[PDB]
Amino acid sequence: NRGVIVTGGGHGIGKQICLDFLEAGDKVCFIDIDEKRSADFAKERPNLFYFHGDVADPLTLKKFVEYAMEKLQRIDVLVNNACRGSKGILSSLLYEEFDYILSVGLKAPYELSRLCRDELIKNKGRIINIASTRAFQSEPDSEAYASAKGGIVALTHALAMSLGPDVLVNCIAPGWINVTFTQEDCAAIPAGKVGTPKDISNMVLFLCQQDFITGETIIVDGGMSKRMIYHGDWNWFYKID
Amino acid sequence: NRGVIVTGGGHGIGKQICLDFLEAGDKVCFIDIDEKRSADFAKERPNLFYFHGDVADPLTLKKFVEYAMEKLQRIDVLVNNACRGSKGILSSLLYEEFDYILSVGLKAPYELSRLCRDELIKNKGRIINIASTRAFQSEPDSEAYASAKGGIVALTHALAMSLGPDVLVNCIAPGWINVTFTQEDCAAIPAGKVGTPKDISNMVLFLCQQDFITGETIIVDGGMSKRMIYHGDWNWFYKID
Amino acid sequence: NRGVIVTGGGHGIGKQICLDFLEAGDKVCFIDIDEKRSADFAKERPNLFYFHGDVADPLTLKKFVEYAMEKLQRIDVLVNNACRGSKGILSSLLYEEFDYILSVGLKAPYELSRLCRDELIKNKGRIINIASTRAFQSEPDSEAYASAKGGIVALTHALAMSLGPDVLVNCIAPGWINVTFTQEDCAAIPAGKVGTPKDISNMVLFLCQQDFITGETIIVDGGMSKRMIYHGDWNWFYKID
Amino acid sequence: NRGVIVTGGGHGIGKQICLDFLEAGDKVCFIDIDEKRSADFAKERPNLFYFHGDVADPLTLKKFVEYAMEKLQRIDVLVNNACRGSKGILSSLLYEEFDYILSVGLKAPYELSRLCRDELIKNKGRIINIASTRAFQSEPDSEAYASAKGGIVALTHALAMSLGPDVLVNCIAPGWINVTFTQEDCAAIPAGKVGTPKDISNMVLFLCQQDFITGETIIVDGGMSKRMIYHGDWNWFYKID
Ligand SMILES: NC(=O)c1ccc[n+]([C@@H]2O[C@H](COP(=O)([O-])OP(=O)(O)OC[C@H]3O[C@@H](n4cnc5c(N)ncnc54)[C@H](O)[C@@H]3O)[C@@H](O)[C@H]2O)c1
Numbered sequence: 020n021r022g023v024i025v026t027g028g029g030h031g032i033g034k035q036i037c038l039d040f041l042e043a044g045d046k047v048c049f050i051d052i053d054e055k056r057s058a059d060f061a062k063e064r065p066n067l068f069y070f071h072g073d074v075a076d077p078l079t080l081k082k083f084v085e086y087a088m089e090k091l092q093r094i095d096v097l098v099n100n101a102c103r104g105s106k107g108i109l110s111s112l113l114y115e116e117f118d119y120i121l122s123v124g125l126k127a128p129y130e131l132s133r134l135c136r137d138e139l140i141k142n143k144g145r146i147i148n149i150a151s152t153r154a155f156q157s158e159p160d161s162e163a164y165a166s167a168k169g170g171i172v173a174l175t176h177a178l179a180m181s182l183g184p185d186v187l188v189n190c191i192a193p194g195w196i197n198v199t200f201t202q203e204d205c206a207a208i209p210a211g212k213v214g215t216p217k218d219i220s221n222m223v224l225f226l227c228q229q230d231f232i233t234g235e236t237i238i239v240d241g242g243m244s245k246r247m248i249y250h251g252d253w254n255w256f257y258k259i260d
Numbered sequence: 261n262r263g264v265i266v267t268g269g270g271h272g273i274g275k276q277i278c279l280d281f282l283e284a285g286d287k288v289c290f291i292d293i294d295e296k297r298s299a300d301f302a303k304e305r306p307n308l309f310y311f312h313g314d315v316a317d318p319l320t321l322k323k324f325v326e327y328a329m330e331k332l333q334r335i336d337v338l339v340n341n342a343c344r345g346s347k348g349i350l351s352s353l354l355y356e357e358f359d360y361i362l363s364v365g366l367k368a369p370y371e372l373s374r375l376c377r378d379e380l381i382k383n384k385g386r387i388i389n390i391a392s393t394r395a396f397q398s399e400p401d402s403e404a405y406a407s408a409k410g411g412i413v414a415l416t417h418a419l420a421m422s423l424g425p426d427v428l429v430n431c432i433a434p435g436w437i438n439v440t441f442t443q444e445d446c447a448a449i450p451a452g453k454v455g456t457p458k459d460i461s462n463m464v465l466f467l468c469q470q471d472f473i474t475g476e477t478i479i480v481d482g483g484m485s486k487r488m489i490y491h492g493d494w495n496w497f498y499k500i501d
Numbered sequence: 502n503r504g505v506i507v508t509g510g511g512h513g514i515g516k517q518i519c520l521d522f523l524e525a526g527d528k529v530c531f532i533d534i535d536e537k538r539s540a541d542f543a544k545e546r547p548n549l550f551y552f553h554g555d556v557a558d559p560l561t562l563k564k565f566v567e568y569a570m571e572k573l574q575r576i577d578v579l580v581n582n583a584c585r586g587s588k589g590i591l592s593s594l595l596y597e598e599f600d601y602i603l604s605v606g607l608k609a610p611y612e613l614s615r616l617c618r619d620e621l622i623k624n625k626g627r628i629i630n631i632a633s634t635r636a637f638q639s640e641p642d643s644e645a646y647a648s649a650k651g652g653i654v655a656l657t658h659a660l661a662m663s664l665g666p667d668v669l670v671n672c673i674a675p676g677w678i679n680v681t682f683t684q685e686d687c688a689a690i691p692a693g694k695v696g697t698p699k700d701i702s703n704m705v706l707f708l709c710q711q712d713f714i715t716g717e718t719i720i721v722d723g724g725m726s727k728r729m730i731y732h733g734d735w736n737w738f739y740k741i742d
Numbered sequence: 743n744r745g746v747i748v749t750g751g752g753h754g755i756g757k758q759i760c761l762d763f764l765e766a767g768d769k770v771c772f773i774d775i776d777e778k779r780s781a782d783f784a785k786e787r788p789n790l791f792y793f794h795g796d797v798a799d800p801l802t803l804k805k806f807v808e809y810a811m812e813k814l815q816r817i818d819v820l821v822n823n824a825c826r827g828s829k830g831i832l833s834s835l836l837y838e839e840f841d842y843i844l845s846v847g848l849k850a851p852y853e854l855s856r857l858c859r860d861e862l863i864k865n866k867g868r869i870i871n872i873a874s875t876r877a878f879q880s881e882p883d884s885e886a887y888a889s890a891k892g893g894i895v896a897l898t899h900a901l902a903m904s905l906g907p908d909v910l911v912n913c914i915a916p917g918w919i920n921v922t923f924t925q926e927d928c929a930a931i932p933a934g935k936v937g938t939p940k941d942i943s944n945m946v947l948f949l950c951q952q953d954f955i956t957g958e959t960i961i962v963d964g965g966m967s968k969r970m971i972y973h974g975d976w977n978w979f980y981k982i983d
Pocket residue numbers: 026027028029030031032033050051052053072073074075099100101102103123149150151152192193194195196197198
């Protein structure tokens with residue numbers, strides 16, 4: 020049926036997204052840097068193809084898409100999911116390392132969209148970007164991650180406006196998703212549980228099926244970002260170390 | 261097997277929401293001010309119950325919930341959908357009429373949530389509020405509608421933080437939904453079509469089934485609000501009369 | 502040389518706003534429900550006029566504007582500041598009391614803007630609404646306050662789009678402003694202090710002097726709403742009781 | 743008094759910011775790629791120092807800050823203003839060119855903040871980032887610009903959270919600022935005029951003086967982004983070419 024490409028499909032959120040599309044009857048090709056885990060994931064699942072590589076490398080991206088077109092023969096959906104968090108200004112994270120985070124989290128989604136532009140337009144496809152609530156609020160020392168995620172939230176509406184009406188483009192901003200808890204861990208989140216990869220993949224598949232939502236970023240974080248918190252009020256306390 | 265209550269269920273978005281829950285196998289009780297249309301809607305649909313009334317009147321809201329509990333015996337989902345458009349400051353909309361808009365669009369959602377509080381908590385239920393993209397951008401002379409819609413967007417995260425983790429509460433902000441077009445009408449929307457009630461009801465039922473989204477407002481407007489528009493650029497033109 | 506009207510001008514933020522305009526050389530007329538405090542405030546300040554009344558009552562609003570036009574002879578600036586905190590769904594806040602909060606925080610700003618419409622247009626004036634960060638995030642049991650504040654944020658862009666280019670209309674959303682602290686109280690706020698009325702009045706007078714900002718809401722909360730908080734991380738802890 | 747560094751200070755917004763700080767009695771060092779214009783700007787203004795260079799180059803950034811410390815002897819304010827727009831996915835903008843835009847608009851602000859971190863903390867300074875309303879809405883073919891601007895909006899709250907309470911960090915998102923008009927050009931903007939560099943520099947200096955605003959992005963666009971626009975309504979028309 021559909022040809023689907025996923026970045027970072029070897030584990031966590033990306034893995035569950037791959038499974039969901041497989042279950043929906045589609046063929047899936049994913050890129051990931053973790054060779055062993057990804058190869059196991061693809062083993063004995065004929066409709067799941069793995070490409071070993073780093074999305075930070077533009078040359079690797081083109082080879083990936085070429086490989087995907089060979090295995091899928093069509094691209095209907097691009098899921099931009101790859102990313103690894105890091106530190107920031109308090110750690111004095113170096114320029115080159117800040118850059119690498121942008122390469123993985125921001126340049127890759129653009130370049131993949133660019134490589135797949137004509138195919139997605141022809142197939143009237145979908146692009147789904149995975150961001151984070153870190154695009155909107157910050158903990159200290161999160162500069163690189165925030166920059167990449169802020170960037171991808173904006174890239175989402177840019178792509179939506181460039182590629183509409185043929186391609187619809189949306190973004191999901193997850194909160195705490197368990198990809199590996201005390202009663203405080205769970206109670207502190209308004210929805211009262213820690214998120215799961217399925218919470219994200221459900222929204223991915225749903226968004227891909229709609230045709231009147233584009234350019235939007237949807238927050239899936241159990242309500243954490245909506246919780247107003249002041250020290251000493253409603254169960255929350257700041258502790259000076 | 262859910263008991264579902266919907267406001268403004270006699271037509272348009274509310275009507276489609278009612279049908280979707282019915283199709284899902286739930287029982288639905290809806291209130292609406294348009295009696296003839298609403299009675300026809302309910303006729304020969306045993307699991308669909310109609311209550312005639314104006315949600316602006318608090319007494320009617322209490323009687324409505326009492327009726328619903330009698331017909332449904334349980335309330336699992338509350339959908340706040342009822343609202344009517346209005347004018348504003350340029351029409352010099354009277355105080356009492358501004359108030360009326362607030363009664364329908366803001367007070368009712370709160371009062372219904374309050375009346376159903378214990379029932380929803382007990383049943384681990386859901387609340388879905390229908391707002392509008394008019395909460396975030398305005399045309400001239402829209403003060404009443406904007407105030408009610410802005411209010412309901414905030415009421416959503418307020419209710420979410422009060423009732424979590426037992427009840428999850430979300431909001432959908434529709435753009436242009438045809439509840440009744442030129443080539444320009446459709447082309448001007450990035451998604452390239454005018455919206456339909458099904459676009460909204462799909463999101464309503466999806467949100468009710470999730471358990472890691474709460475307090476959020478999701479924009480469903482074909483990308484219209486994400487489109488940057490300046491006169492003379494990219495096909496848009498301002499015309500002085 | 503401006504005629505300025507302020508609601509809730511007898512204390513706290515409103516009071517400081519009044520003083521700032523007086524210092525700027527303007528004449529100020531303010532309404533407030535606290536008579537003794539407000540009379541003292543006005544005493545022996547010839548350019549400061551006090552009108553006793555509850556902004557919840559539409560008749561009082563009209564009489565208030567009439568008084569102001571008699572004392573000021575012209576209205577250049579309207580500052581909607583009056584509001585009182587409340588409870589919500591967990592306290593089962595009654596319908597009539599929820600309504601009252603809306604009367605003070607949402608209906609009054611609209612009605613005052615409506616009463617002053619022609620005067621403000623003629624004078625190329627300004628409207629400044631005081632909201633709260635509670636428009637965007639919630640603590641439990643805050644439904645009434647959230648609804649009014651969310652409403653006023655939207656009312657702001659509605660009024661801006663109706664009255665532009667003649668009248669510019671903006672909103673300030675304060676965080677914690679001391680209108681009356683532990684080491685933790687101050688350290689928990691990223692800016693490292695509790696806010697003061699002057700922090701708000703500075704922005705009020707600044708916004709009135711600009712001519713390229715309209716419809717916006719500016720957050721003045723020492724960065725509190727931008728702080729991502731998860732239990733156990735970066736000095737924050739959730740405590741179950 | 744204060745030591746101020748500005749990127750892109752040779753023309754437009756950056757130039758006006760430099761002038762404003764000079765007028766305030768501070769010493770200003772600015773980097774710019776346009777040598778002739780920048781040298782003229784600095785000519786015979788003893789407190790204004792020009793450094794020729796491209797902010798895209800990390801080595802140039804370090805030399806710039808070293809030069810600035812030599813001329814100013816202290817850094818109290820960092821204004822991240824440099825940026826040049828480009829195209830995007832419809833032009834199939836190449837990876838390397840997308841990257842360059844990120845280097846100028848996103849990497850530079852981070853690296854400069856990083857280089858000046860200790861100095862700004864010691865001096866309890868300020869960082870002001872210049873973004874754009876393009877961070878929040880898009881015209882077609884704007885991917886690179888959107889990505890950089892979205893990134894810098896998020897970088898702003900990240901820096902604010904990392905460096906508070908010692909350094910406050912804010913962002914201004916300009917709309918149409920004339921740095922070089924028909925009656926439609928002006929009437930189409932709700933505030934009824936095109937923006938000027940002074941509209942931005944006023945906000946820069948104001949923000950630098952506040953101490954209870956941090957992590958915030960302020961929109962200065964004459965209300966354009968708040969205007970709801972649908973084809974055929976309220977003077978706006980989409981034309982299919
Ligand atoms: N997990 C969370 O709490 C959370 C929160 C917010 C956002 N996110 C976002 O979710 C997405 C997936 O993250 P996750 O939580 O599943 O992380 P994860 O580590 O569990 O999985 C990410 C996958 O991507 C792969 N990967 C990383 N860098 C790569 C590269 N350069 N080239 C190719 N493959 C690479 C990894 O091998 C891994 O399999 C990311 O974009 C992340 O920013 C996650």
